[PDB]
């Protein structure tokens, strides 16, 4: 479990991607960083996830929104 925080969001072209100090980029869509009801963000968004490793690098699955 670590945080992350908006490199930029692409909400509208269908994805977004996170920065993270010590690792990558973490890849992210507004469906699993998703919560109760439909949601948006905007830059400087840090959020709360699991990033693991599969055939395009490490990216988050299971990420929300940082309270």
């Not at 992210?28 to 490793?53: D, N, W």
């Amino acid at each position: 479990m670590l945080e992350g925080k908006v490199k930029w969001f692409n909400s509208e072209k269908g994805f977004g991607f996170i920065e993270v100090e010590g690792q990558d980029d973490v890849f992210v869509h507004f469906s699993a960083i998703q919560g109760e009801g439909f949601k948006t963000l905007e830059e400087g968004q840090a959020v709360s996830f699991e990033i693991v490793e599969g055939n395009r690098g490490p990216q988050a699955a299971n990420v929300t929104k940082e309270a």
